[PDB]
Scaffold this active site. Sequence first.
Site, short mmCIF file in Angstrom:
data_model
loop_
_atom_site.label_atom_id
_atom_site.label_comp_id
_atom_site.label_asym_id
_atom_site.label_seq_id
_atom_site.Cartn_x
_atom_site.Cartn_y
_atom_site.Cartn_z
N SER A 30 0.69 -1.13 -0.10
CA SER A 30 0.35 -0.26 -0.08
C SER A 30 0.92 1.29 0.40
O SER A 30 0.12 2.30 0.50
CB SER A 30 -1.05 0.29 0.97
N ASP A 298 21.52 15.94 7.48
CA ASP A 298 21.90 14.80 8.46
C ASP A 298 23.81 14.89 7.85
O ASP A 298 24.40 15.61 8.60
CB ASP A 298 21.64 13.81 8.22
#
Length: 343
Positions: A30, A298
Amino acid sequence: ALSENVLFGMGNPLLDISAVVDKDFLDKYSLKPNDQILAEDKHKELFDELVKKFKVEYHAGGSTQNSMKVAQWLIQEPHKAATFFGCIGIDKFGEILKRKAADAHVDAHYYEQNEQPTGTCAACITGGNRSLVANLAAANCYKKEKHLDLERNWVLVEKARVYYIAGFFLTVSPESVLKVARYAAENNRVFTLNLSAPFISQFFKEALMDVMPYVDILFGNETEAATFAREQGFETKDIKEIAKKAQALPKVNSKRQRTVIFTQGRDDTIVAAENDVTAFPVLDQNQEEIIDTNGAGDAFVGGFLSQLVSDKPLTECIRAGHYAASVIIRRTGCTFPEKPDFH
Ligand SMILES: Nc1ncnc2c1ncn2[C@@H]1O[C@H](CO)[C@@H](O)[C@H]1O
Ligand SMILES: [Cl-]
């Protein structure tokens, strides 16, 4: 020459698993082609199927660990300049993650436990799209008293000149964060922290504000800054004013002035220090070459830290952060070529 373990990070390690998948796979789980989600019950077998059915590439991931590997990449020598602590499982993914951390020349010391599998992040690629599914799992299970507090690990904390912990880790082991922060203050070493996500400032404000007096460098982005300001009653929405006010928050180590660094995507990086606020333009504006912004923050932090450990000037730390981000956002996730070209 830098010593080994000069930079210390701790946080939530994830094994990154990237693959080109097909329509059937996305449909089964999904997933829309660019969904970025935390794993739900329906996704618990996804990572096992992904590795069984597709050719994959593995990387050492999670926010703080990403910053450590980027810092190490830019430091180059010595290997094991960057330390990383976090929690993994006793499983095949944990063994792969140890190998990838070692391949990245990071000195990773993980707390291993049997109750939860190693955390994972799948990048499920179709054409130019990629669907991200993260399952924190073992990363949430870090035990201060069974890892950080053991002398063989604590001494590595004591080897550092600079500390960096993503605010995400405040949701797991705030007592670990506080202990490292206290040590940094006691020893006049540089402690740095990321706001990480708006929900940290909303739901983990107790832990966040407990650590804040120990923070020498606060990293974040514009969205986190806005939430932080609202939650702390700053009475301003102006990013420069937010940075100035955060800079002036109570601070225990008065031998070091706080610096507050807020990125703004393609807009200027804002830096508040004791006597001024400075804007650093992002010179990489080729938006059409950006394929994935995941890990940009990051990487910015990792680049910044790579120069901070050598006491390079602020301008150089920002330049390295902007460089690292520019490299990472042209690749799936927080990855980079074998060698840096930062000059
Ligand atoms: N849209 C963008 N264009 C250029 N650089 C970006 C963009 N989004 C993020 N970055 C880079 O990543 C950093 C962290 O978001 C920014 O400070 C910038 O360096
Ligand atoms: Cl993290």
